[PDB]
Design an enzyme around this catalytic site. Structure first.
Site, short mmCIF file in Angstrom:
data_model
loop_
_atom_site.label_atom_id
_atom_site.label_comp_id
_atom_site.label_asym_id
_atom_site.label_seq_id
_atom_site.Cartn_x
_atom_site.Cartn_y
_atom_site.Cartn_z
N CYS A 153 0.85 -1.20 0.00
CA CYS A 153 0.00 0.00 0.00
C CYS A 153 0.87 1.23 0.00
O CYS A 153 1.97 1.21 0.54
CB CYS A 153 -0.93 0.09 1.22
N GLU A 187 1.40 -3.83 -5.78
CA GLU A 187 0.26 -4.71 -5.58
C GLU A 187 -0.99 -4.18 -6.26
O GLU A 187 -1.37 -3.01 -6.08
CB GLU A 187 -0.03 -4.90 -4.10
C1 LIG Z 1 0.04 -0.38 -4.32
C2 LIG Z 1 -1.43 -0.51 -4.26
C3 LIG Z 1 -2.06 0.71 -3.64
O1 LIG Z 1 -1.67 1.24 -2.64
S1 LIG Z 1 -3.44 1.30 -4.55
C4 LIG Z 1 -3.94 2.72 -3.54
C5 LIG Z 1 -2.99 3.89 -3.70
N1 LIG Z 1 -3.24 4.91 -2.69
C6 LIG Z 1 -4.37 5.60 -2.61
O2 LIG Z 1 -5.22 5.61 -3.51
C7 LIG Z 1 -4.55 6.40 -1.33
C8 LIG Z 1 -5.03 7.82 -1.60
N2 LIG Z 1 -4.21 8.52 -2.56
C9 LIG Z 1 -2.96 8.91 -2.31
O3 LIG Z 1 -2.39 8.73 -1.23
C10 LIG Z 1 -2.25 9.65 -3.43
O4 LIG Z 1 -3.17 10.10 -4.41
C11 LIG Z 1 -1.10 8.87 -4.11
C12 LIG Z 1 -1.66 7.78 -5.04
C13 LIG Z 1 -0.16 8.22 -3.08
C14 LIG Z 1 -0.31 9.89 -4.93
O5 LIG Z 1 0.35 10.81 -4.04
P1 LIG Z 1 0.69 12.31 -4.30
O6 LIG Z 1 1.63 12.76 -3.22
O7 LIG Z 1 -0.48 13.22 -4.43
O8 LIG Z 1 1.43 12.18 -5.70
P2 LIG Z 1 2.30 13.19 -6.55
O9 LIG Z 1 2.14 14.58 -6.05
O10 LIG Z 1 3.67 12.71 -6.52
O11 LIG Z 1 1.64 13.16 -8.01
C15 LIG Z 1 1.53 11.94 -8.78
C16 LIG Z 1 0.83 12.18 -10.10
O12 LIG Z 1 -0.60 12.00 -9.94
C17 LIG Z 1 -1.29 13.14 -10.39
N3 LIG Z 1 -2.45 13.32 -9.52
C18 LIG Z 1 -2.43 13.19 -8.16
N4 LIG Z 1 -3.55 13.53 -7.57
C19 LIG Z 1 -4.37 13.89 -8.62
C20 LIG Z 1 -5.69 14.38 -8.66
N5 LIG Z 1 -6.42 14.62 -7.57
N6 LIG Z 1 -6.22 14.66 -9.88
C21 LIG Z 1 -5.46 14.48 -10.97
N7 LIG Z 1 -4.20 14.04 -11.05
C22 LIG Z 1 -3.71 13.76 -9.83
C23 LIG Z 1 -0.30 14.30 -10.29
O13 LIG Z 1 -0.66 15.40 -11.13
C24 LIG Z 1 0.98 13.59 -10.70
O14 LIG Z 1 1.03 13.42 -12.13
P3 LIG Z 1 1.91 14.42 -12.98
O15 LIG Z 1 3.34 14.05 -12.69
O16 LIG Z 1 1.60 15.83 -12.53
O17 LIG Z 1 1.56 14.08 -14.44
#
Ligand SMILES: CCC(=O)SCCNC(=O)CCNC(=O)[C@H](O)C(C)(C)COP(=O)(O)OP(=O)(O)OC[C@H]1O[C@@H](n2cnc3c(N)ncnc32)[C@H](O)[C@@H]1OP(=O)(O)O
Ligand SMILES: [Cl-]
Ligand SMILES: [Zn+2]
Length: 284
Positions: A153, A187
């Site tokens: 996760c 995963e």
């Molecule tokens: C391994 C199996 C799993 O764990 S599946 C479940 C994954 N985790 C979750 O869904 C929990 C809730 N979500 C999160 O914690 C975050 O969204 C996760 C997936 C960890 C991404 O973290 P975060 O710190 O925001 O990522 P980042 O800033 O490095 O950006 C990654 C790329 O994704 C994109 N992204 C992100 N959020 C959005 C959004 N709300 N709407 C649209 N796009 C989104 C970002 O723009 C970025 O992409 P880019 O590089 O800008 O092209």
């Protein structure tokens, strides 16, 4: 768990829907199986350092003044400027890891049983200031993965989302895989946000390698990156950089086209993993 309006005459048993952690309040996205007594209050209060969950502002405030933790447990295996990662073995910090898993499940559709933490190692990301090391997010990893998963996760807490911490954590997971001399993949299934994050990371890495080398098979890319051949192929397909010839995937790109992609607004990680700041050896 139940949702919708409860029938006439019944009492709705409330689940946890809002947490107070450090100086953030965060709404829940999903049900998490905190004990029912904790769900009934308007907020759940978490110690930002030990992740103990509490029922009242007054018990929270008492804890705040007594708890001596100012960082995650375990070993600080990464430190660059004020960004740190702690490695926390679920066998050795059971309560902390259980607390973390209950927290995490508020933002995940599904998760393994929150008490079954011994099979996992947790990598906790923190931003450090004079007061302490403040949790941003984490990923977990199975010690032994039947499916070859290098992340179980992954989570960035909502107030820290969209700032590059998720791609930092993804990068970090592959740095571990590289040191283990193995490929790995997250995963499945990936959430929609998960998919966007991984595709962004994979695209950036593969583009960067195809321009720094300038031209190098899919096998070569997999060995260099620890990204699986399947994840490379799906990513190259989305970049329109692969052809299929007699049942075989063939990379097809020029340096000019790679640069066009890297120069576009669609593909630049604000924080990256510096190998010189990582202190880790595989177990294995
Ligand atoms: C391994 C199996 C799993 O764990 S599946 C479940 C994954 N985790 C979750 O869904 C929990 C809730 N979500 C999160 O914690 C975050 O969204 C996760 C997936 C960890 C991404 O973290 P975060 O710190 O925001 O990522 P980042 O800033 O490095 O950006 C990654 C790329 O994704 C994109 N992204 C992100 N959020 C959005 C959004 N709300 N709407 C649209 N796009 C989104 C970002 O723009 C970025 O992409 P880019 O590089 O800008 O092209
Ligand atoms: Cl919120
Ligand atoms: Zn505490």
């Amino acid at each position: 768990h139940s949702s919708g309006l409860v029938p006439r005459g019944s009492t709705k048993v409330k689940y946890v829907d809002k947490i107070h952690i450090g100086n953030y309040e965060i709404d829940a996205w999903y049900f998490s199986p905190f004990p029912e007594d904790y769900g009934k209050q308007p907020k759940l209060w978490l110690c930002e350092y030990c992740l103990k969950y509490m029922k009242y502002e007054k018990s929270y405030r008492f804890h705040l003044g007594q708890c001596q933790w100012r960082q995650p447990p375990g070993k600080e295996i990464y430190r660059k400027s004020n960004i740190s990662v702690h490695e926390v073995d679920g066998k050795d910090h059971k309560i902390y890891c259980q607390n973390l898993c209950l927290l995490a499940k508020l933002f995940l559709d599904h998760k393994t049983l929150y008490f079954d933490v011994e099979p996992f190692v947790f990598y906790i990301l923190t931003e450090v200031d004079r007061q302490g090391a403040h949790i941003v997010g984490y990923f977990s990893k199975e010690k032994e993965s039947p499916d070859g998963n290098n992340v179980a996760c992954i989570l960035t807490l909502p107030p820290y989302q969209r700032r590059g911490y998720g791609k930092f954590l993804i990068a970090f997971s592959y740095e571990l895989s590289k040191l283990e001399s193995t490929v790995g993949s997250p995963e499945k299934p990936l959430s929609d946000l998960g998919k966007l994050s991984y595709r962004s990371y994979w695209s950036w890495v593969l583009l960067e390698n195809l321009r720094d080398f300038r031209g190098l098979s899919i096998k070569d890319l997999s060995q260099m990156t620890s990204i699986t051949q399947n994840d490379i192929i799906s990513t190259l397909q989305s970049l329109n950089m692969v052809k299929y010839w007699k049942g075989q995937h063939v990379i097809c790109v020029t340096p000019k086209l790679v640069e066009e992609h890297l120069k576009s607004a669609q593909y630049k990680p604000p924080i990256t993993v510096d190998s010189v700041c990582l202190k880790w050896a595989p177990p294995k």
